[PDB]
Amino acid sequence: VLTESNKKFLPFQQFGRDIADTTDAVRDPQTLEILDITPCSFGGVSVIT
Amino acid sequence: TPINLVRDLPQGFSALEPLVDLPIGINITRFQTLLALHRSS
Ligand SMILES: *[C@@H]1O[C@H](CO)[C@@H](O)[C@H](O)[C@H]1NC(C)=O
Numbered sequence: 001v002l003t004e005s006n007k008k009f010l011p012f013q014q015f016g017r018d019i020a021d022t023t024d025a026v027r028d029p030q031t032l033e034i035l036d037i038t039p040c041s042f043g044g045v046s047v048i049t
Numbered sequence: 050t051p052i053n054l055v056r057d058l059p060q061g062f063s064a065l066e067p068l069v070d071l072p073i074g075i076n077i078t079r080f081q082t083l084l085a086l087h088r089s090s
Contacts, residue, residue, distance in 0.1 A: 012067050
């Protein structure tokens with residue numbers, strides 16, 4: 001999900017990585033908008049019978 | 050950074066943000082600063 005980022009990316013910075021080196025924020029190449037990235041919603045499915 | 054001291058490099062922390070990558074491919078093994086002079090031997 002490409003939500004509007006609150007991160008204050010410095011002018012030289014492009015990305016932002018997680019503790020596992022997964023990018024959690026990105027810099028749009030065409031505009032200086034900072035976009036933070038959250039994983040697509042997931043979870044287990046359990047059937048109650 | 051703003052400094053009001055002329056010697057004894059002040060303590061504390063100050064990061065150096067990258068200012069230019071300069072995609073160059075030379076070898077450098079001898080360095081020499083280029084300093085102006087107050088000419089006014
Ligand atoms: C250093 O640069 C010189 C160029 O004068 C070159 O001849 C030499 O091979 C270079 N050395 C290394 C270790 O790259």
